[PDB]
């Protein structure tokens, strides 16, 4: 038995009382960009119900070309019009640099990744930087609200940041 | 006011009962690659608890360079050793091709995006394809288990797909 097995076990209970199917587009027309950090249950964090929001999470909550891609699809095909960015404190990107990280994998693997680790030092500065990354971007344009916050992994609180 | 606003309210009542902080590395040493789809509450779907699992999401659960980047970080930095891949039935990715989408964007903006929109026509198949990408990828290696499932939006049951 692995943890994949346990989660599949857990799925049997969830499926017992699943009610659906709900309609495809987000019923509150909002999309969240979050981090993949294990301490962040993005749904309970904002009281999201099923069928309501799009949630997008990667390492560091970095607005990547996959995040733009996702977002662009989200607005243009499933009619989202709000955006919430969510970095957080004690995030796992203020501990390594890109040069360090790639050299690491280079030693083992023999090659460098083409992609960019996208680490950053200060989380708050990067909520700013990530907001900007969406401002300038020409494909995520259909939104009437774009605000980015910082999740306090010690307290559960959202602290907005000004661009 | 807005949904962002409503969500923040909900965050207040979350931070009341919140117990933390927790340690960084996912306590059950697993990662999940999921879709951004509104109808998928991945945590409740696999019985996840705060601090256990990395959750990675995007449009259509595609193993883009972002997902590899996040997986390589998740494993190399925070020691995750199982991967769950998680497509689903009736995904937005099914109802368009890439060329059309980039075109629509151009006629609207004047620009073709640089990224591949990454649609697919068969969910069950592209699980194998997504599994196949991680398999042959030289930066996602430390994992012991790799399995892929299809979440059924109408029942809530997973359906394991095999390579
Ligand atoms: Cl999530
Ligand atoms: Mg913009
Ligand atoms: Zn993080
Ligand atoms: Zn989807």
Burial of A133 (0-12, 13-18, 19+ CB in 10 A): middle
Domain ranges, residue A162: 1-163
Show the beta-strand stretches assigned E in chain B: 30-35, 53-58, 82-88, 145-151, 160-161
Burial of B24 (0-12, 13-18, 19+ CB in 10 A): middle
Contact B91, B37 (CB under 8 A): yes
Going by C-alpha positions, the residue among A25, A58, A132 that lies closest to residue B39 is A25
Alpha-carbon distances of B94 from A71, B90, B91, rounded to whole Å:
17, 7, 6
Order the strands of the A30-35 sheet from edge to edge: A53-58, A30-35, A82-88, A145-151, A158-161
- Left (φ > 0), alpha (ψ -120 to 50) or beta: where does A51 sit? left
Distance, in Å, from the CA atom of A31 to the CA atom of A79, rounded to the nearest integer, reads 10
Contact A13, A7 (CB under 8 A): no
Total of domains in chain A:
1
Would you tell me how many other CB atoms lie within 10 Å of the CB of residue A8? 17
- Joined tokens for residue B24: 């960084």
Determined by which method? X-ray
Q: Which of B4, B6, B39 sits opposite A22 (nearest CB)?
A: B39
Burial of B118 (0-12, 13-18, 19+ CB in 10 A): buried
Collect all residues with Cβ–Cβ distance below 8 Å to B101 and sequence separation of at least 6. A73, B117, B119
- Joined tokens for residue B11: 């965050």
- Minimum-distance ligand to the CA of B58? 4
Q: Do B59 and A73 touch (CB under 8 A)?
A: yes
Burial of A135 (0-12, 13-18, 19+ CB in 10 A): exposed
Q: Check which CATH number belongs to the domain holding A41 and give it.
A: 3.40.1050.10
Query: What b-and-e string marks burial along B89-99, b requiring 16 or more CB atoms within 10 Å of the CB?
Result: eebbbeebeee
Q: Which of A58, A68, A84 sits opposite B7 (nearest CB)?
A: A84
Going by C-alpha positions, the residue among B45, B161, B154, B163 that lies closest to residue B89 is B154
Distance, in Å, from the CA atom of B92 to the CA atom of B40, rounded to the nearest integer, reads 13
Q: Do A38 and B18 touch (CB under 8 A)?
A: no
SS3 assignment, position B84: strand
Q: Could you give the dihedral angle defined by the CA atoms of residues A69, A74, A77 and A82, in that order, rounded to the nearest 10 degrees?
A: -130
- Left (φ > 0), alpha (ψ -120 to 50) or beta: where does B109 sit? alpha
Question: Ligand 1 being an ion, which residues bring their Cβ within 5 A of it?
Answer: A 42, 55; B 42, 55
3-state secondary structure chain A: CCHHHHHHHHHHHHHHCCCCCCCCCCCCCEEEEEECCCCCCHHHHHCCCCCCEEEEEEHHHCCCHHHHHHHHHHHHHHCCCEEEEEEECCCCCCCCCHHHHHHHHHHHHCCCCCCCCCCCCCHHHHHHHHHHHHHHCCCCCCCCEEEEEEECCCCCCEEEECC
| Residue B135: DSSP 8-state | H
Q: Do B28 and A3 touch (CB under 8 A)?
A: yes
Distance, in Å, from the CA atom of B85 to the CA atom of B130, rounded to the nearest integer, reads 8
Q: Which of B38, B47, B109 sits opposite A54 (nearest CB)?
A: B38
Would you tell me how many other CB atoms lie within 10 Å of the CB of residue B86? 26
- Joined tokens for residue B127: 């699980």
Distance, in Å, from the CA atom of B44 to the CA atom of B57, rounded to the nearest integer, reads 15
SS3 assignment, position B14: helix
């Amino acid at each position: 038995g692995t943890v994949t097995d346990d989660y599949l076990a857990n799925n049997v209970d969830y499926a017992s009382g699943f009610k659906g199917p709900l309609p495809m587009p987000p019923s509150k027309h909002i999309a969240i960009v979050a981090c993949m950090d294990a301490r962040l249950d993005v749904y309970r964090m904002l009281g999201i119900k099923e069928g309501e929001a799009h949630v997008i999470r990667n390492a560091g909550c970095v607005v990547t070309d996959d995040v733009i891609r996702s977002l662009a699809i989200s607005q243009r095909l499933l009619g989202t019009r709000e955006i919430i960015l969510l970095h957080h404190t004690d995030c796992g990107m203020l501990t390594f640099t890109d040069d360090d990280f790639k050299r690491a994998i280079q030693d083992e693997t023999g090659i460098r990744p083409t992609w960019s680790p996208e680490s950053y030092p200060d989380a708050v500065e990067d909520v700013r930087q990530s907001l900007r990354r969406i401002e300038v971007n020409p494909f995520v344009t259909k939104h009437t609200s774009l605000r980015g916050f910082v999740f306090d992994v010690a307290t559960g609180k959202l602290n907005e940041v000004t661009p």
